[PDB]
């Protein structure tokens, strides 16, 4: 899914759906993860 | 009460209001040790997970097979390192399997 | 060319699940629950019960076949000598420890205590493995004592003793490092070996995930069993999930359809379990076959297959049992402290092009030397040490130099 | 539950009783008169209440 | 239904392949066991020839020729490759 | 004995599958999507999805 | 859907066998020189890319 | 003493043509004090 329609998906769940931090990737958008320009080994 | 499934694990007696627990009664699969019809016709039965010549093993209750002290590269598998066979001297004997002949290699630092 | 001046002997663990629990379920009990008035109906579905029981029994015997193939590689069991003078190598961490009621090794004990699953239900049962953990440990001890005390010979004929420093000299020579590298550093080698071996224990104690490849297997089986038994709670569209309720509330002519729904649902669930178990048993059989191949080609010998036995050049691997699996401590010689010299493909003496016999030409800036390809050990370049072929005009990268003729001084002295 | 061995001539030549003894129980389970050496699973038993 | 993306993008897989390939070119087989250490390529091919039981000189004495064949062979496969990939087409078609 | 006197370095391909498309299907919405009435009935089958 | 999942399990097991063969082939042919006869291409092996 | 190939017993007099030199007689552990016959001496004599 795209980051535009994410919120449509208690208060904590609402916050996570909305997202103070939103990142868009090939595997759809994710919330709660800070995106960096660094790079590490897969975790 | 109940177990992981809907089967009842415990019940309260409606007459005396006493607690009780229920367990399925003695059951299990049954197998038989046969050395081959074309070589004999006696057979020794084995109850897989029941508590009981007669003989007891970690693999179940084996009757009709006579225990013997020593061990041989075993013919057929019973379980828990116990095998049986019509060898030895005209009946099924159940023993503990032997792995191989002892062989201490004569090791020394200059040989 | 950059070639090593030092080495490190590193032992790396490799886990391999060789078998799984021998579960069996009697279709009749699981589906009907000992309700004869329901077994009579189940009999109308054909030979499904017999087929499922046959499949599960096949998997059960295949597990014991897997264990037999992987571990029972030796026709006879060997006993390590009482005296433990292996030339400085210290195997106390892999060999069985008599100081415990069980005949395991400290690594084996730690390995076994780090994997964990009495539960009984209706129909489901588990058969004990053919080779009890004590017997698997005895087989492992046999293989381990054989490899320590008789090199690789015990796996391909009679057990021919050989002093362990000499055995490791042979194993070194098997990877292109001359024998004199080992003896002249024997003590050092031993220390590294010992250290590495000790280190492995801490690694097994480092995280719970070390035994993951085994744990997963167990977990998977458990999951399946759970989701099978839990399927008895579902009713599959009937009016109740318990056959007793059906037969107590409804008369036979009407209860027949509800029992039909329950029979169909239970049979489908058990069929799904059996098929998943067949796939999983095929995967475990492949893993056990790979484990048997590793035990045959690594413990009983020394493989040129580059990464079959962990990073580095394989020297020897000692097996260790583990609950439903095996663990190999692949010992590997790994180069280190590489120094880079200038190199040439061939030297010239009097127009004759000398190529190294087995080593390689390397120059420490000033004059050349011949050194084996995996451990910097410069030797004066001599006609005995390097062979001849062709002449100057053909090779590209040739470098002028003088190759010592070993007979010149004696020839001059005696003529 | 009898297991009867017919013949190419069409005439019953021998029979085996499923419950006479464990050996015959296997002979019924394998659906063959001849039972090879080994360990055979035949049935599952429960203690009657 | 959906199809999840692979962990390693085609770019990352290509990078892995290029790393392996450059390691093979510039270090022979050593990078696969311990630390990668350089060795001139014709000398590495001499090592491999020795591996198959043909003495070192047989390479150098005609190194040029060897190289040419190698190059030609590589070119050929490309032309042969643009003919197949049935082993992968079969997988994708089956799925 | 026949001895070689020349060589012809050859290069040969070998294709090998390594992974298939990672597909994933919702059972709940595949059997019946956006229909609570059928989802309730499907819940009877238990943990098949 | 159950049929599709079972067939996918079989197919993925086949692909996993192929991937294991590819892994060993890369290990033994690329990262080294192999004595196995037809493993790394027909003929005597020199090196694989 | 003798030099014999592994995995088959074929003794051969220890000679400079089947042994390679190293060390100084102090680093290796467990050496022995036997001698190596040199093929060149009989030719010289
Ligand atoms: C090869 O490396 C080993 C270590 O891996 C070296 O041995 C070490 O030498 C230092 C010298 O002060 C000691 O402090 C260490 O305790 C030694 N370690 C071990 C494990 O013995 C060895 O000297 C190196 N050899 C060469 C030629 O450089
Ligand atoms: C071989 O290794 C064992 C350990 O696996 C050594 O035994 C230990 O030695 C240390 C140091 O003296 C003691 O603190 C420990 O209590 C000993 N036992 C254990 C279980 O660690 C042993 O000394 C080493 N050498 C020989 C010749 O056995
Ligand atoms: C290079 O290797 C030589 C070994 O030969 C090192 O030792 C010198 O070698 C030359 C001739 O071989 C002698 O004349 C010197 O007396 C040797 N020096 C010593 C201290 O024994 C040499 O040191 C190495 N390094 C260089 C830069 O030549
Ligand atoms: C290596 O030695 C050869 C032979 O001594 C050198 O080749 C000669 O170089 C001289 C230079 O004037 C020519 O006149 C000769 O015709 C060459 N051939 C012979 C057979 O003498 C060569 O130059 C030296 N150096 C190198 C890098 O090869
Ligand atoms: C997501 O929405 C943004 C904003 O309209 C658009 O630019 C982008 O292309 C969209 N991506 C996908 C994958 O739909
Ligand atoms: C990271 O890279 C992006 C590239 O577009 C850039 O915009 C951004 O400022 C960089 N730093 C951070 C903290 O994102
Ligand atoms: C009924 O059961 C209760 C509970 O035990 C008991 O106290 C009472 O005497 C019983 N009455 C009769 C008539 O049995
Ligand atoms: C049940 O098993 C235990 C442990 O093996 C044994 O001590 C006991 O005698 C058994 N009882 C019967 C009735 O078989
Ligand atoms: C071994 O034989 C002796 C003598 O018959 C007997 O007392 C003992 O119980 C036997 N041991 C086993 C394990 O059968
Ligand atoms: C060794 O490598 C370094 C760079 O890695 C280079 O500067 C140096 O010249 C090399 N040594 C020789 C002898 O070529
Ligand atoms: C490569 O090395 C050879 C070795 O002698 C030398 O003759 C040649 O000139 C070198 N080529 C380059 C381009 O440096
Ligand atoms: C039995 O088989 C024989 C074979 O020759 C045949 O002659 C005979 O008619 C068959 N039937 C009876 C009843 O004998
Ligand atoms: C080997 O074959 C090549 C290719 O035709 C040829 O150029 C070369 O001369 C041949 N070698 C010999 C010794 O004839
Ligand atoms: C072997 O051990 C003895 C002590 O029993 C010792 O004297 C001898 O030097 C040792 N030799 C070797 C080669 O280990
Ligand atoms: C070997 O001989 C040398 C010199 O002859 C002597 O110093 C040494 O002690 C001898 N070693 C033995 C073990 O006899």
């Amino acid at each position: 899914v795209n980051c535009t329609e994410v919120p449509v998906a208690t208060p904590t769940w609402r916050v996570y759906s909305t997202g103070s931090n939103v990142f868009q990737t090939r595997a759809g958008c994710l919330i709660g993860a800070e995106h960096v320009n660094n790079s590490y080994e897969c975790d | 009460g109940r177990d992981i499934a809907d089967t009842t694990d415990a019940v309260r007696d409606p007459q005396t209001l006493e607690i009780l627990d229920i367990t399925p009664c003695s059951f299990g699969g049954v197998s038989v040790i046969t050395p081959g019809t074309n070589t004999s016709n006696q057979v020794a039965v084995l109850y897989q997970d029941v508590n009981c010549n007669v003989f007891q093993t970690r693999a179940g209750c084996l009757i009709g097979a006579e225990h013997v002290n020593n061990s041989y590269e075993c013919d057929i598998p019973i379980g828990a390192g116990i095998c049986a066979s019509y060898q030895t001297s005209q009946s099924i004997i159940a023993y503990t399997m032997s792995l191989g002949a002892e062989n201490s290699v004569a090791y020394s630092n200059n040989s | 060319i950059a070639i090593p001046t030092n080495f490190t002997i590193s032992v790396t663990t490799e886990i391999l699940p060789v078998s799984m629990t021998k579960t069996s379920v009697d279709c009749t009990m699981y589906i009907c629950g000992d309700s004869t008035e329901c077994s009579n109906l189940l009999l109308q579905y054909g030979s499904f019960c017999t087929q499922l029981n046959r499949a599960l029994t096949g998997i059960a015997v295949e597990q014991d076949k897997n264990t037999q193939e992987v571990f029972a590689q030796v026709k006879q069991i060997y006993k390590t000598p009482p005296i433990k003078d292996f030339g400085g190598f210290n195997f106390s961490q892999i060999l069985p420890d008599p100081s415990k009621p069980s005949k395991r090794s400290p690594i084996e004990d730690l390995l076994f205590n780090k994997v964990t699953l009495a539960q009984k239900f209706n129909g489901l049962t588990v058969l004990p493995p053919l080779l009890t953990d004590e017997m698997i440990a005895q087989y492992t001890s046999a293989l381990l004592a054989g490899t320590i005390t008789s090199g690789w010979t015990f796996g391909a004929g009679p057990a021919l003793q050989i002093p362990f420093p000499m055995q490791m000299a042979y194993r070194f020579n098997g990877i292109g490092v001359t024998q004199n590298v080992l003896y002249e550093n024997q003590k050092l080698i031993a220390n590294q070996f010992n250290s590495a071996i000790g280190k492995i224990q801490d690694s097994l104690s480092s995280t719970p995930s070390a035994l993951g490849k085994l744990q997963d297997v167990v977990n998977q089986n458990a999951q399946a069993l759970n989701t099978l038994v839990k399927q008895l709670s579902s009713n599959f569209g009937a009016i109740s999930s318990v056959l007793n309720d059906i037969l107590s509330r409804l008369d036979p002519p009407e209860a027949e359809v509800q029992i039909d729904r329950l029979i169909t649902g239970r049979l489908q669930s058990l069929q799904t379990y059996v098929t998943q178990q067949l796939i999983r048993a095929a995967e475990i059989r492949a893993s056990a076959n790979l484990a048997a191949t590793k035990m045959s080609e690594c413990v009983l010998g020394q493989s040129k297959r580059v990464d079959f036995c962990g990073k580095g050049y394989h020297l020897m691997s000692f097996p260790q049992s583990a609950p439903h699996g095996v663990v190999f401590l692949h010992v590997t010689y790994v180069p280190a402290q590489e120094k880079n010299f200038t190199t040439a493909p061939a030297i010239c003496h009097d127009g004759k092009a000398h190529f190294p016999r087995e080593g390689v030409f390397v120059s420490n800036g000033t004059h050349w030397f011949v050194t084996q390809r995996n451990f910097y050990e410069p030797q004066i370049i001599t006609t005995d040490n390097t062979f001849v072929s062709g002449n100057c005009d053909v090779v590209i990268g040739i470098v002028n130099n003088t190759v010592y003729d070993p007979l010149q001084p004696e020839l001059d002295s005696f003529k | 539950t009898f297991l009867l061995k017919y013949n190419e001539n069409g005439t019953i030549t021998d029979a085996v009783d499923c419950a006479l003894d464990p050996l015959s129980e296997t002979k019924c389970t394998l659906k063959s008169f001849t039972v090879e050496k080994g360990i055979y699973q035949t049935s599952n038993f429960r203690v009657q209440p």
Side-chain angles (χ1 to χ4, degrees), chain D:
Chain D
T1 299
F2 265 58
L3 164 147
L4 291 93
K5 166 185 170 184
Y6 290 92
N7 155 13
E8 60 262 31
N9 248 4
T11 181
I12 276 165
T13 320
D14 213 17
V16 157
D17 186 346
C18 173
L20 162 53
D21 37 7
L23 175 55
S24 57
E25 187 130 316
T26 78
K27 283 194 273 200
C28 267
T29 325
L30 296 320
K31 294 266 169 34
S32 157
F33 259 36
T34 168
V35 56
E36 273 290 1
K37 166 181 73 179
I39 186 87
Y40 288 83
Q41 217 148 36
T42 59
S43 61
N44 308 264
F45 94 112
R46 284 161 280 81
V47 66
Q48 197 277 320

Side-chain angles (χ1 to χ4, degrees), chain C residues 364 366-367 369:
Chain C
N364 79 332
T366 70
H367 29 286
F369 298 117

Side-chain angles (χ1 to χ4, degrees), chain C residues 154-378:
Chain C
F154 84 108
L160 310 168
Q161 66 218 256
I162 182 173
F164 197 83
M166 296 193 66
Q167 189 214 139
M168 276 286 289
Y170 285 6
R171 287 170 179 290
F172 262 59
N173 197 307
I175 57 167
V177 188
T178 44
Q179 319 201 8
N180 77 88
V181 156
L182 179 129
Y183 303 123
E184 301 182 318
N185 304 303
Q186 189 182 132
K187 280 169 74 71
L188 166 71
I189 295 276
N191 280 8
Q192 292 180 10
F193 186 102
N194 295 347
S195 302
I197 276 283
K199 190 188 302 184
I200 204 60
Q201 216 166 340
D202 310 2
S203 186
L204 289 175
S205 178
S206 71
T207 166
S209 55
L211 272 283
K213 285 213 287 190
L214 304 184
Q215 276 283 15
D216 196 356
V217 169
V218 179
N219 290 353
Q220 266 193 115
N221 297 151
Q223 190 70 22
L225 275 185
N226 253 22
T227 288
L228 190 66
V229 84
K230 271 174 75 64
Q231 285 267 309
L232 289 183
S233 175
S234 298
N235 63 72
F236 305 95
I239 63 64
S240 177
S241 64
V242 191
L243 275 93
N244 290 99
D245 275 46
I246 299 280
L247 271 283
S248 160
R249 282 163 44 155
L250 294 166
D251 62 328
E254 192 295 336
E256 185 161 320
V257 47
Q258 302 285 313
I259 292 276
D260 274 346
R261 276 215 256 286
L262 250 61
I263 293 278
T264 311
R266 305 268 182 82
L267 178 63
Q268 183 178 358
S269 97
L270 179 47
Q271 186 74 69
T272 283
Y273 164 74
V274 157
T275 294
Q276 299 315 298
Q277 209 70 356
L278 286 166
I279 307 295
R280 207 182 317 294
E283 147 180 13
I284 291 302
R285 181 218 291 137
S287 279
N289 282 352
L290 171 58
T293 309
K294 285 213 188 227
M295 179 92 74
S296 266
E297 308 180 10
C298 316
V299 180
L300 317 185
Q302 169 175 26
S303 57
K304 301 293 205 76
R305 311 180 59 197
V306 75
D307 273 15
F308 208 52
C309 323
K311 258 58 62 175
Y313 300 92
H314 181 61
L315 292 197
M316 62 201 315
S317 48
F318 321 95
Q320 297 288 276
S321 61
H324 305 306
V326 75
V327 168
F328 299 100
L329 312 174
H330 300 303
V331 188
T332 51
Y333 164 104
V334 161
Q337 291 166 35
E338 67 254 11
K339 272 222 302 186
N340 64 329
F341 319 80
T342 304
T343 194
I347 289 268
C348 285
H349 195 219
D350 309 32
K352 284 169 280 290
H354 289 84
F355 300 75
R357 183 65 55 75
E358 80 205 340
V360 73
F361 295 160
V362 309
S363 100
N364 79 332
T366 70
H367 29 286
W368 298 81
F369 298 117
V370 157
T371 166
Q372 66 212 330
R373 316 165 160 148
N374 306 124
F375 184 89
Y376 179 66
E377 200 193 356

Side-chain angles (χ1 to χ4, degrees), chain B residues 2 10 12 22 28 37 50-51 53 58-59 68 73 79 83-84 89-90 92 95 97:
Chain B
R2 276 180 159 161
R12 190 192 283 272
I22 290 161
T37 166
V50 184
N51 196 6
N53 311 147
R58 193 164 183 170
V68 79
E73 152 166 40
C83 274
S89 298
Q90 201 173 197
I92 313 302
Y95 45 62
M97 174 193 328

